[PDB]
Amino acid sequence: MRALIVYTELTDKDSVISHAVARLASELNDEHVETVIIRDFEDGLAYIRSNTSIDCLLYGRDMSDRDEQIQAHRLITQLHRRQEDVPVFLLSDREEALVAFDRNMMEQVDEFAWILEDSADFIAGRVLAAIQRYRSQLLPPLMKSLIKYSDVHEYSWAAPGHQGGVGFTKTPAGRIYHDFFGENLFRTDI
Amino acid sequence: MRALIVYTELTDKDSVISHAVARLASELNDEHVETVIIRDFEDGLAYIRSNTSIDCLLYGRDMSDRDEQIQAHRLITQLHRRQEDVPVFLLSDREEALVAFDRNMMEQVDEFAWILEDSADFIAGRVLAAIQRYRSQLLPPLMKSLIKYSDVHEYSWAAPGHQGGVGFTKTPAGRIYHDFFGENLFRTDIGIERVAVGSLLDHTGAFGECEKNAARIFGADQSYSVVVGTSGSNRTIMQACMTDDDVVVIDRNCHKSIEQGLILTGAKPVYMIPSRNRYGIIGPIYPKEMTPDAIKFKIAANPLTKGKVKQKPAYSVVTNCTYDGVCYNARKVQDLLDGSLDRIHFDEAWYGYARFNPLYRNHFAMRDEERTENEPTIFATHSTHKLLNALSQASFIHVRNGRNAIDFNRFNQAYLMHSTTSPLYAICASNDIAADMMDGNSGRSLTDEVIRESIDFRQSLAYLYKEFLNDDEWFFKPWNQEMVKDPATGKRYAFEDAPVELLMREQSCWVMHPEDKWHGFNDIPDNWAMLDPIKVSILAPGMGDDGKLLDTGVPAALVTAWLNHYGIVPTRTTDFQIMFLFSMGITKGKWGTLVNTLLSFKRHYDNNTALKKVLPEVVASAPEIYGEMGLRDLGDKMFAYLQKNNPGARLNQAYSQLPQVMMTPRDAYQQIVANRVEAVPVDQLMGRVAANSIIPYPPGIPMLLSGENFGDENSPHIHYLRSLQAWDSEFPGFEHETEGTEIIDGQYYVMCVKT
Amino acid sequence: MRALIVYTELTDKDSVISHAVARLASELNDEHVETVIIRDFEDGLAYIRSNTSIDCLLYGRDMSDRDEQIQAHRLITQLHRRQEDVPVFLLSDREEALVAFDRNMMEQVDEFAWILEDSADFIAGRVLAAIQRYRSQLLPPLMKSLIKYSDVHEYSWAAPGHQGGVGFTKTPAGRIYHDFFGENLFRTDIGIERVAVGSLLDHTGAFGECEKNAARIFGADQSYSVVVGTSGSNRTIMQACMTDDDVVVIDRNCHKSIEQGLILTGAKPVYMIPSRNRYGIIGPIYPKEMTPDAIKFKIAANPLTKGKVKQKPAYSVVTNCTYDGVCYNARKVQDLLDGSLDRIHFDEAWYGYARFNPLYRNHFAMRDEERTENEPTIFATHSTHKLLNALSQASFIHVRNGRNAIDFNRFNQAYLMHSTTSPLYAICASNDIAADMMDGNSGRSLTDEVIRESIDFRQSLAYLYKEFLNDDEWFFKPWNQEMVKDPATGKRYAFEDAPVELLMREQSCWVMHPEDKWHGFNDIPDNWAMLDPIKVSILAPGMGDDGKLLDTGVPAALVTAWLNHYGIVPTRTTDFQIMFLFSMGITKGKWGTLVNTLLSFKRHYDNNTALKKVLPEVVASAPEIYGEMGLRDLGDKMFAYLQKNNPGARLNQAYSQLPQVMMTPRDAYQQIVANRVEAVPVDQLMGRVAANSIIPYPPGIPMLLSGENFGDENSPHIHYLRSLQAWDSEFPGFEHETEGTEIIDGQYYVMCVKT
């Protein structure tokens, strides 16, 4: 589980937003969510264009700057080109975000996180819930069922005879073969 | 133990103050006091607005800058909103602080720490002493005594038999259970025979202190902690107030525990009928139901009480607020009922926070007022788990003594009759902590948080509604005023354009005015009812402002299914109405999720997405009809059904006529006990007496009670039951609820008295 | 996950088997399976007798030694006493195990592991699969579903408002509360609107599975889980069974919830009078109270029911066992009452374990028998928290349908009338786990442990009694048989000399025989009553075997004060009787502590130690009389008081005559409601009607109920109240309890009906 936090300048004194984002990142790392913190939309865009899985996007911008609004929209569109249903939270001061509320905001924002006036534990819980919801819908049906059933290891009394690859691990060449191709290939040969 | 040090610029060279604060932080960390150092009041304020426990605040400012003086005052006020008695030390140069000394300084400063000329060890010692003093007074009495006694582990030779959870750790499943719920839950299950704690039933020890503290907080003369919920609370109040030879005045909008009390006492009920609007929302009882004339008319017209017209009613019950968030003006309700009654019961099960925010002023039972001697006795039941912070089954009875009051010895018999001899002290401790969380500044702070959250949701939803309207498109709108008026400046506002401080401060922005069209309770007096902001109803399109369906619409059953798919279970629902609850357990900004979900619905409703993708659990009900079909198609089918059959007029006819009463609820229940009852199909209910209550959803309030007649072949009540059954058969998976009926072969049976 | 490997000597050179087991243990530790390796069956047995969860047993023995075969069989049987379905693998050489293959092997072996010729990875995989299979079936249904659903954290938009405990973590005291009780308690407080779990009130989901499982375990047709305790259980059974026009047969040894049910139903009661012994212990109702002749006589002699002699009683209640541990032969009780009754209620609140040990055979309600069609309906209430392992307020109703049964639709109305609409699911989960702990082998194992513990205490105390007797000195003796008789060999035994297996196996060693002098219930039939071994009464010296006080003695009030000083609070106490409770939460050998304490008393009683040293809390009551005084001095003063006033004959006269009945309990309670009542001093109770019940301790059962007359100036009941008051005034700090009286100025007031 990995969350990307892209924020540029949310307070007139960057200390406040920096410490709030630090507390949030600490809570996320406590619930086993790796975090990547980026301070510019260009670097965030370059990070998204690498083939890294991002399970949640938390961004915050100036909220009075149209240039950063366009940059953030471009960021989220780039994110959803290949990672289409990733949750996006808006990190913002409450009032700056409520004066900017409209349909265009909600077409790209999934959640609000008032970072400056809320517990980081609460936001982290909501992030983790959104990540779990996202990952439960990610795989296509057959792959999902095969990955679930590959955890079942017992000896069935029917073919294939290698029985999830157990048959191979009885000669040394068979053990080399089995280690080369890995266990899951043979566990899905059901 | 955690100390927050917020200092900005105390010396002309920041090195001096920085090194002094570093030495102080080192000494505090040596005495086991975690420290958080912040260099700006904005970041300190943001840190305080997280739910972190702060045991001491040490701050220092410029001392020549008025802007930082205001920032520091705001910081300390924010700190004390929820952490009310935290010690505050001033970190300062001696002379700059002594020239600034006055009453205003000492109203917020508790201690001085001359950081630049004193040992850090001395300051740390004084900080630690202040922290210990603060933490010794933090817990409420019962919780404090239970936490102390939970350290006692020895085998007592008496029940409960699990002996602090030791009994569970003897089988493997018991060990899993014990590890899941933890040791402390079982260590506090001690039994009523420990004099170190007291007993609930005797009202002694920490339990007496708890109930006196709760009476202080909630503004009552006496308070009673209940471990059977507001069911038990209502049941014991009714058992104490009325007897078999009494007549009582019952809000027809009553919880089933009220009829349980009627069955257990045997009293003869008279009903005040509430009002409806076009959306099927149950509204307030009008004042013309409560006047002494109306009550004497109702008594004289009742087949059971017409021989009691010379008799004063012994009890009345009013539900405030209603399930849909309608709050009565309880001052005026009390003044009307004081003309006929000595005892008034307010079932405030959903309405326990109301005392702790000025927005609800005069709209609850236990008010801060000058109390006359000629006042009636006032009972108020709170379900502490519904909207306060307590475990299930926790409840309070609050008594404000007046005319014809019930003293303690008489009331305790009814109290014991409906209680247990072995109460679970975790429930009592949750009552204690729930009353504590509302005491002082924290009650106001928490109710403000919830109300601001709900107002944000309301204004955002109204904004989106107008915005889709400019696109000539449909959307969900909140059920509240469209235009508000600032009384001070006289300026008018669209609801979504009004300032949040106006809506949180001004009570008239929530009153139902007889000239406004939003609430739909025609002919309501002014300043009689109010909308509770945190019971947020949203209206699906389809109902017209005059009471007839529009050409097109979206039924709320489909949107409710959509929401249930996503884990969002609404509390209340009608044909076009969905009620969401904002509680003090909600977090800030969560409502955005809800907005998002609604927007998703609209897209999938406009694209007519196949039900197989979006709502497979609905297709799983009747795959032959719900497969092969889309979302907008099912919506249009439901709306055409509503146009053809129009169950709203059915509801109005069933609830505007009260059924004929044949016997008291106790007599009908005793027909059940005597086995003189039988299940009857709906098509055969003519002239049959109901043996139990029938509560259809909607509207969620009882249509018939025990002992009432279903009526003729033309009775509106049988017609409405048929309407519900017809919906249920037409739309599988979207079946209504009806408490009091069995459903055999998709067909309703009512248990009626044998002829 | 933990695997126990018990192997002794499998190869002629232990190196081979040792290295094979080491490789296996290494593989298991690689798949996250902790291992415990033991080289002897005695140490393995001692390890199993600790309460450690073992998920798999892998054992290997010599395979040519019959002694180790027996040791291994004993090991596996001990394992499955409390961990019943744990997988057992045989570790063996192939051929030694295949020559030993037979049915007896496979009755205890689940898997083979040829440890000497197979990969340790393969064996570890099969062990892990068996462990996972075992753990998936370990929890009972409701607990399993709650543990699964507790992982769901999202904000629901409905009550409870604390939202899985999030609401508490917003004030500092709330955070302390939340940390003390832990997260899982609040995560399981979910409300009744989650279809993943079901609802208690509808009996659906995991709640239906739970109640069906409990009906299976406890031997009932239907079971009902109750969150209001046996108070609520009794109250709902009585509400379902009887009406205002009924006559009912009540054990005069009744819990106050029985009279609460009488008040709530209005039925006219007739009382069966229990017996006493010389120690003031309440014993069984004799069969001559239960015959149809006796019941028709009682009905015809009652001022309230003499117009109902042609009417069949609708209900009877019998308390089994009594508070002092006297168990009726419930087969014979049922056969007697089957001649007058269709419904019999057994209030088995203290007696829930009885089904699960053969020592209680035929002495409880839900028996393993061939069931006739002409049997009456049987109700049984268990207080699952008193002697089973459950949280307070947990209870079961058990129904075995017979004549004039109450079907589900009729019973559920009474069930809902006395319940809450928001049950705390922790209580329901505790019922579920308590029923699970008694299922299978573990019920027998746990009841055996408790009974053996209590028998050890009894025999040790009887031994010390005889040993002090040979020294011609006094001591405490247990209240049980002095001589037991083995029926098989006919051999007689002193109780302290009998084999423990005889006393745990043979039921006749606990029956009260009419020729024995220990129990003191003169004229009792044989094979009618039994002593429950785990309710251990000890007798202080001072009462003679004929009913009169001896020349010297030690009153139990002083010994009770001594025990309370040390944290040992007895359940029951009379003049010379102290009852201790052994529960399944007790640990082994704990009773020694109790023995030690008693011995201490004797020393400090013989040395006449000053009360200031040993019992300062007693001197704190009246320092003018209890200072300056010693322990033996106060004991002699108390005993002289008992000799002069003799309250035992007072108790016998007050409880051998029933008071005159003036009205039903409901009519007296309704006089309370009508405010027609008043407090009255004891000296003025002549001819006054009691408005509530009077329950003096001793004997702890009600002396008067509501609506009964105190009587003339010569009434035994007023005399006994005066005796209690006189004791209380003479000996401050040793005051009796009397439920139903107020104590103003150290003087008793009873709330009586106004004339």
Residue numbers in the entry:
A (entry chain F): 1 to 190
B (entry chain D), C (entry chain C): 1 to 755
Please share text taken word for word from the publication where this structure appeared.
Bacterial homologous lysine and arginine decarboxylases play major roles in the acid stress response, physiology, antibiotic resistance and virulence. Inducible AAT-fold basic amino acid decarboxylases (LAOdcs) have been studied since the early 1940s1,2 because of the link between their enterobacterial pathogenicity in humans and their ability to overcome the aggressive pH environments and oxygen limitation in our gastrointestinal tract. These enzymes decarboxylate either Lysine (LdcI, also called CadA), Arginine (Adc or AdiA) or Ornithine (OdcI or SpeF) into corresponding polyamines while consuming protons and producing CO2, thereby buffering the bacterial cytosol and the extracellular medium to promote bacterial survival under acid stress conditions. Here we show that the Adc from a multidrug-resistant human pathogen Providencia stuartii massively polymerises into filaments whose cryo-EM structure reveals pronounced differences between Adc and LdcI assembly mechanisms. Like all proteobacterial LAOdcs, the P. stuartii Adc monomer is organized in three different structural parts.
In the decameric double ring, two monomers form a C2-symmetric dimer, which represents the basic unit of the structure and forms a decameric assembly through strong inter-ring contacts between adjacent dimers. This type of dimerisation is typical for proteobacterial LAOdcs and for pyridoxal 5′-phosphate (PLP)-dependent enzymes in general, and leads to a completion of the active sites of each monomer buried into a cleft at the dimer interface. The N-terminal wing domain protrudes into the centre of the double ring and is involved in stabilisation of the decamer assembly though inter-dimer contacts (residues 1-139). Preceded by a short linker region (residues 140-192), the central core part contains the covalently-bound PLP cofactor and is composed of a PLP-binding domain (residues 193-439) and an aspartate aminotransferase-like domain (residues 440-608). The C-terminal domain (residues 609-758), located at the decamer periphery, partially constitutes an entry channel into the active site. The Root-Mean-Square Deviation between P. stuartii and E. coli Adc monomers is 0.52 Å (over 4424 atoms), which illustrates their strong overall similarity. At the sequence level, the wing domains of the P. stuartii and the E. coli Adc proteins are the most different (52.14% identity) whereas the PLP-binding domain is the most conserved (77.33% identity). Although the exact residues involved in both dimerisation and decamerisation of the P. stuartii and E. coli Adcs differ, the buried surface area (BSA) and predicted ∆G upon decamerisation is similar for both proteins. In contrast, our Mass Photometry analysis of P. stuartii Adc indicates the presence of the decameric species at pH 5 and 6.5, whereas lower molecular weight species are detected at pH 8 but also unexpectedly at pH 4.
